[PDB]
Amino acid sequence: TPVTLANCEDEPIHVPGAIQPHGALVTLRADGMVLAASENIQALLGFVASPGSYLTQEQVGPEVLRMLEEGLTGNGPWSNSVETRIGEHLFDVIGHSYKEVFYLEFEIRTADTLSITSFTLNAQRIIAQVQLHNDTASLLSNVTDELRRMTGYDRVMAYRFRHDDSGEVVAESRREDLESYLGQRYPASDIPAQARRLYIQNPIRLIADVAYTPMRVFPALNPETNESFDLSYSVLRSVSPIHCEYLTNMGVRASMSISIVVGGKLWGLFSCHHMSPKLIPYPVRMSFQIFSQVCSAIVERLEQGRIAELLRVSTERRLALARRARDADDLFGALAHPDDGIAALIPCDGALVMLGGRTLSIRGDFERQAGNVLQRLQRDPERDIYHTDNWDCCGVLAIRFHRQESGWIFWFRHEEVHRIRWGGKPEKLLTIGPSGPRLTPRGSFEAWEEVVRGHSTPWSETDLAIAEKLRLDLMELCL
Amino acid sequence: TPVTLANCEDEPIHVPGAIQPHGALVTLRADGMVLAASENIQALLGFVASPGSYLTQEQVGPEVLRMLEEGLTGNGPWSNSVETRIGEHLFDVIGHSYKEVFYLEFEIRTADTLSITSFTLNAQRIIAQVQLHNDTASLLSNVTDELRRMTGYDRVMAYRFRHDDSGEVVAESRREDLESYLGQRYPASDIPAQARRLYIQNPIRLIADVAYTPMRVFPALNPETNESFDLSYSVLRSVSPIHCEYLTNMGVRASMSISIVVGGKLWGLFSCHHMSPKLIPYPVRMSFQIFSQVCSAIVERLEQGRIAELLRVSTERRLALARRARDADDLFGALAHPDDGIAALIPCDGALVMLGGRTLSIRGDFERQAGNVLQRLQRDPERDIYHTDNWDCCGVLAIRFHRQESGWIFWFRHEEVLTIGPSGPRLTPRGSFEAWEEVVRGHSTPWSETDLAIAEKLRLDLMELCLNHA
Ligand SMILES: */C=C/C1=C(C)C(=O)N/C1=C\C1=NC(=C\c2[nH]c(/C=C3/NC(=O)C(C=C)=C3C)c(C)c2CCC(=O)O)/C(CCC(=O)O)=C1C
Ligand SMILES: */C=C/C1=C(C)C(=O)N/C1=C\C1=NC(=C\c2[nH]c(/C=C3/NC(=O)C(C=C)=C3C)c(C)c2CCC(=O)O)/C(CCC(=O)O)=C1C
Numbered sequence: 029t030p031v032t033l034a035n036c037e038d039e040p041i042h043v044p045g046a047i048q049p050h051g052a053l054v055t056l057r058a059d060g061m062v063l064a065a066s067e068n069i070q071a072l073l074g075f076v077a078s079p080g081s082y083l084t085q086e087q088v089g090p091e092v093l094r095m096l097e098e099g100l101t102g103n104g105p106w107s108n109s110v111e112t113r114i115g116e117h118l119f120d121v122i123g124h125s126y127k128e129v130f131y132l133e134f135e136i137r138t139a140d141t142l143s144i145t146s147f148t149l150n151a152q153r154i155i156a157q158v159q160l161h162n163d164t165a166s167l168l169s170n171v172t173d174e175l176r177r178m179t180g181y182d183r184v185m186a187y188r189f190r191h192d193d194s195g196e197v198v199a200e201s202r203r204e205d206l207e208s209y210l211g212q213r214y215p216a217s218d219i220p221a222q223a224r225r226l227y228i229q230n231p232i233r234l235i236a237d238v239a240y241t242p243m244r245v246f247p248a249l250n251p252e253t254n255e256s257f258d259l260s261y262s263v264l265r266s267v268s269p270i271h272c273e274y275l276t277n278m279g280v281r282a283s284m285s286i287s288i289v290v291g292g293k294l295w296g297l298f299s300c301h302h303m304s305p306k307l308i309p310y311p312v313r314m315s316f317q318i319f320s321q322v323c324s325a326i327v328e329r330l331e332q333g334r335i336a337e338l339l340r341v342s343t344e345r346r347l348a349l350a351r352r353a354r355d356a357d358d359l360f361g362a363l364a365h366p367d368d369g370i371a372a373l374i375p376c377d378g379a380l381v382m383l384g385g386r387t388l389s390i391r392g393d394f395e396r397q398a399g400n401v402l403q404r405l406q407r408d409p410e411r412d413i414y415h416t417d418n419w420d421c422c423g424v425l426a427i428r429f430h431r432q433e434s435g436w437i438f439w440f441r442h443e444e445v446h447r448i449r450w451g452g453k454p455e456k457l458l459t460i461g462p463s464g465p466r467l468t469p470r471g472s473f474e475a476w477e478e479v480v481r482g483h484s485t486p487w488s489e490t491d492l493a494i495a496e497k498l499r500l501d502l503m504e505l506c507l
Numbered sequence: 508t509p510v511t512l513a514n515c516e517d518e519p520i521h522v523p524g525a526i527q528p529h530g531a532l533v534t535l536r537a538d539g540m541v542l543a544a545s546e547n548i549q550a551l552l553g554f555v556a557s558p559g560s561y562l563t564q565e566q567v568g569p570e571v572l573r574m575l576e577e578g579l580t581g582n583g584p585w586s587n588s589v590e591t592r593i594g595e596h597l598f599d600v601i602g603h604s605y606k607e608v609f610y611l612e613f614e615i616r617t618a619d620t621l622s623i624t625s626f627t628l629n630a631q632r633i634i635a636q637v638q639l640h641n642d643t644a645s646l647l648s649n650v651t652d653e654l655r656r657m658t659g660y661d662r663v664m665a666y667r668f669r670h671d672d673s674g675e676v677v678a679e680s681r682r683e684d685l686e687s688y689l690g691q692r693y694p695a696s697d698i699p700a701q702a703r704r705l706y707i708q709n710p711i712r713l714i715a716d717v718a719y720t721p722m723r724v725f726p727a728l729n730p731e732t733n734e735s736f737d738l739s740y741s742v743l744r745s746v747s748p749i750h751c752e753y754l755t756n757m758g759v760r761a762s763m764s765i766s767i768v769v770g771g772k773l774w775g776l777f778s779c780h781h782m783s784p785k786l787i788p789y790p791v792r793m794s795f796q797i798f799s800q801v802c803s804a805i806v807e808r809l810e811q812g813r814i815a816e817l818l819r820v821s822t823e824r825r826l827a828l829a830r831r832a833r834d835a836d837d838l839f840g841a842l843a844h845p846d847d848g849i850a851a852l853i854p855c856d857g858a859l860v861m862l863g864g865r866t867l868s869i870r871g872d873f874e875r876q877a878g879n880v881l882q883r884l885q886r887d888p889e890r891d892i893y894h895t896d897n898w899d900c901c902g903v904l905a906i907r908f909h910r911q912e913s914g915w916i917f918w919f920r921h922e923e924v925l926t927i928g929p930s931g932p933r934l935t936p937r938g939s940f941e942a943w944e945e946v947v948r949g950h951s952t953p954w955s956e957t958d959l960a961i962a963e964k965l966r967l968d969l970m971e972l973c974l975n976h977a
Pocket of ligand 1: 035041209214220223267271285468469470
């Protein structure tokens with residue numbers, strides 16, 4: 029059924045019946061028999077791959093056939109890209125085997141191929157820069173700027189995805205002309221499950237011309253299975269109408285994205301946008317897929333090194349709490365210490381200490397809410413750690429360290445705030461599509477707002493780790 | 508100037524006019540004027556080089572000269588390459604630029620391949636190994652295996668260079684007919700200073716054939732400076748006769764290495780040895796060059812991640828020490844404690860604690876020695892911190908934490924512990940190990956700056972406690 033805003037969350041974009049027109053596609057079954065092909069084989073390649081047929085050396089050349097032959101029956105690895113000029117143009121021919129189907133893709137090459145030396149040199153510079161700077165925010169920033177020098181794209185941004193899958197533009201190099209989307213936030217809904225899986229499975233993804241018209245592949249179904257063809261790993265797999273509308277609203281008509289994958293999760297991706305159709309040669313894209321690997325590798329460690337630091341200041345800051353509580357025998361004093369205090373342990377907008385009936389509220393008037401939270405927990409006598417990002421103050425983390433005299437510690441966070449807003453000279457809409465204003469950056473951001481309304485920043489894994497240890501410390505102190 | 512074992516430490520391996528015969532070299536000055544070339548240029552290539560000669564289009568083709576042209580007009584260290592025709596035993600023309608000399612190196616592109624020569628394909632495969640592992644040891648162990656699978660070398664090893672630059676075989680996958688070299692410690696003098704400057708500035712080295720026949724370049728002197736050509740960044744640079752003699756004693760005749768550089772140190776390298784002559788294509792070597800950098804990067808933050816962990820357990824067990832010491836007023840109880848004690852604070856074979864006339868030693872008898880040390884610390888009575896590796900036992904790290912009652916804490920470490928050529932057994936693994944034994948005799952594994960940082964921190968902790976006792 030036709031994709032609407034109402035059902036786009038479930039659009040199966042891995043089994044579209046089409047490909048992008050700047051290439052051709054022939055899908056083969058495990059024994060070499062053609063199962064399907066795209067409308068334009070004869071026009072682009074000058075021959076008709078008929079279902080039931082087997083390709084000949086005559087049709088598609090020795091280079092392609094030899095790859096096709098070692099590629100089909102595929103124990104062990106094999107070169108899966110080949111050059112050949114079947115016609116008058118130049119074709120990179122790319123083959124891969126997913127499920128049990130073999131996809132043979134013909135993509136026209138335009139620009140000079142990858143200069144492997146001048147790519148190695150560029151790889152040095154980037155690794156050398158992040159050698160100096162162990163900010164993962166600096167890596168993103170540098171590689172972003174660098175991607176634009178290399179590719180020549182009009183804009184390249186770096187997205188970081190939070191735990192709730194929402195996105196944030198944490199870097200950007202555009203040409204002076206264009207408006208900046210720096211600091212943009214967008215909801216999980218802007219990158220649906222299927223699209224997200226595809227960003228994890230595929231490092232690089234390219235959209236040559238957004239204002240194109242899809243070239244269908246027939247037959248639509250796989251006669252061997254009576255189900256659609258899975259084009260997850262296809263270089264030419266067509267784009268969604270929804271997205272294409274979104275992109276044209278922005279005035280963008282060529283996209284090129286490099287994934288950053290850590291764990292199973294998609295940690296973020298570099299998005300390259302062009303204002304006119306743009307095509308990047310397969311082997312070049314393959315060099316960028318290397319960046320995808322390197323960044324993912326580096327970013328992973330930079331991140332685990334950061335939580336490592338958080339954990340170090342935590343323990344050191346707990347050590348001070350012991351150096352301090354055991355001397356004068358007053359928790360409150362130690363806990364309320366400005367720099368090393370609990371309000372500084374876990375990032376928050378305020379804290380509250382309870383022991384006996386004594387209440388020390390730090391950075392605001394938190395007794396009332398701490399009182400109300402406690403009344404709730406009264407109906408839940410066995411809970412020792414409470415935390416919610418719903419509820420003055422909607423984020424709450426409570427740990428009980430002494431039950432008899434009801435000793436608790438509370439951290440509070442206010443609603444989540446958009447870090448950086450742009451203002452002044454406002455809003456050149458460019459055309460709006462039929463689907464509505466939802467498919468514009470402003471529409472997306474407003475969609476994010478509605479999502480986070482009433483929610484604080486989520487209690488990190490580490491924030492919870494530190495609090496659980498702090499609770500253990502407080503328990504033994506009271507003993 | 509013959510290479511003798513005694514002289515070889517100064518051997519200038521970076522200048523010798525010889526190259527390896529599997530390729531051809533042509534050296535030009537800034538303006539494209541030929542200054543020198545190997546005596547096999549016309550053997551492999553169409554024509555003959557000659558000083559004063561500005562490169563002939565007819566012999567080198569359009570791409571190459573056209574490449575050199577854009578290179579010439581660039582004032583930075585030029586590095587580029589193209590694959591092109593020359594009589595149709597076609598080549599990879601790979602050029603660089605050191606000083607103001609332009610070098611063109613010619614490698615034969617071999618049609619018959621049973622493996623994948625795609626630069627992007629190979630690069631993606633090894634680099635994938637980096638993303639997988641957390642151990643810096645696991646990584647080395649696994650990339651070692653993957654390298655042997657990818658290249659098919661008879662043996663591939665991974666070295667780690669300690670503080671004294673003595674290396675250690677930490678990982679190894681071999682053909683099961685070959686003896687194991689795992690653990691082998693060899694002296695720093697098996698890799699001279701010059702060899703190291705090169706391994707550091709060059710991610711990849713390739714010796715195609717060990718019993719090679721040095722293909723001389725003429726002229727030998729650089730006409731302009733009248734001083735030797737520096738082939739530091741050359742691929743086809745000839746190989747030291749001493750090293751070659753070393754490899755032949757081992758029955759090795761083909762060799763490739765991947766450097767690992769963190770900071771400016773040859774942290775370690777992957778060495779591939781083959782028992783028969785072997786050759787890797789240029790683009791595949793570039794596959795390993797970019798891996799060298801990526802691996803270096805990841806290894807660095809894997810290491811600094813490791814010390815960060817060390818420091819966390821330090822602050823952690825240091826915290827427990829403080830708790831234990833404040834709970835019951837007596838220090839010794841927490842210092843002597845098994846897992847959270849000082850003996851487990853810093854890698855050591857033993858520990859000792861002095862406070863007043865009361866001395867407590869952990870895991871050994873260090874009282875006699877603690878005394879001697881303490882006695883040398885009579886001089887410089889202001890010395891709060893001390894450490895060394897020479898001296899009974901040789902690893903001594905001492906900190907003072909209480910002046911009035913001579914409160915000291917010590918950590919102690921023990922000492923670390925048939926077809927040969929004309930130079931003798933010195934150039935065999937057996938010789939190397941022995942040589943290393945000589946070097947390490949009176950030295951214990953050095954105290955890392957992390958060990959010292961921990962001791963230094965501990966010391967501060969203790970003083971604070973003693974002041975608080977009052
Ligand atoms: C009904 C589902 C979708 C809605 C709603 C929507 O807006 N897009 C939907 C589907 C897809 N989005 C895909 C990629 C994609 N979309 C965005 C969204 C943005 N939100 C913003 O605020 C901004 C810019 C300010 C953007 C661009 C992004 C960031 C991406 C990733 C690629 C890119 O950055 O261009 C997508 C995949 C298409 C494909 O196959 O490439 C689908 C489907
Ligand atoms: C007189 C100086 C040298 C001595 C002594 C020596 O053994 N080699 C000397 C000069 C050079 N060594 C070079 C490289 C090199 N040598 C070793 C030595 C080993 N010691 C061992 O115990 C084992 C094995 C158990 C070995 C292999 C190594 C490891 C290396 C690095 C390269 C490799 O691993 O093969 C060297 C550089 C030669 C070049 O140009 O590649 C010089 C010069």
